[PDB]
Amino acid sequence: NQIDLNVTCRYAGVFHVEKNGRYSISRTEAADLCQAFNSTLPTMDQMKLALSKGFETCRYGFIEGNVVIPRIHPNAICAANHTGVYILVTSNTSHYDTYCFNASAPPEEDCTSVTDLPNSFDGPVTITIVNRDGTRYSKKGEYRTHQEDI
Numbered sequence: 001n002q003i004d005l006n007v008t009c010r011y012a013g014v015f016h017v018e019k020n021g022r023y024s025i026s027r028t029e030a031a032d033l034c035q036a037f038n039s040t041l042p043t044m045d046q047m048k049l050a051l052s053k054g055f056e057t058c059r060y061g062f063i064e065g066n067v068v069i070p071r072i073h074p075n076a077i078c079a080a081n082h083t084g085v086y087i088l089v090t091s092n093t094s095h096y097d098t099y100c101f102n103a104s105a106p107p108e109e110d111c112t113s114v115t116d117l118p119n120s121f122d123g124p125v126t127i128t129i130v131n132r133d134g135t136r137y138s139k140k141g142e143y144r145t146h147q148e149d150i
C-alpha cells in the first residue's frame, strides 16, 4: 500500500505532481491531492503567471477546467513544439498528472524541496513525496475522498 508523488519547483505557487511515475490521476483525485498539499487546482490565469516566471513541464496535467502542458521552449516531443499554456483538446482517456497552486508559496521561482504533505488524513497508505533532487519524505496517510479512485 504505497503511493509515490513526484513534485517540482513552485513558480508563483504552481507546481506539478506525478503519481507513481505514470499518468494515473483522475480529476476528482487531483482535487483531493492538491487539498493534501493545502493547495487548489490552478486557474488558467494562475498557470499563465507561473509560466511567465519560468514554469514548464513535458507532462499533461489538470488545472481547473482543462488538461494542459506549460511550455516555454519549443520541443517537438512536448506539446508538439507549442509554447504557452498548451491545452489538450482531444483525448480518449481521463487520467493525467496534476498541477496544484499554493497561495502561501513565494511569488516567483521556488526550487527548494518539499518535505511534507501537510493536510493528509489518517490512513494506511505509505505516501512518499519525491523531489527532483531525489530527497524524500514518507508518511502514513490517505488523501482520497472518492471511492472510485481507491
Ligand SMILES: C[C@@H]1CC(C)(C)C[C@H]1NCc1cc[nH]n1
Pocket (backbone or CB within 6 Å): 010, 015, 037, 038, 039, 102, 105, 112, 113, 114, 115, 116, 118
Ligand atoms: C504546504 C506547501 C505545499 C508546497 C507548496 C508544496 C510547499 C509547502 N510549504 C512549505 C515548503 C516550502 C518549501 N518547501 N516546503
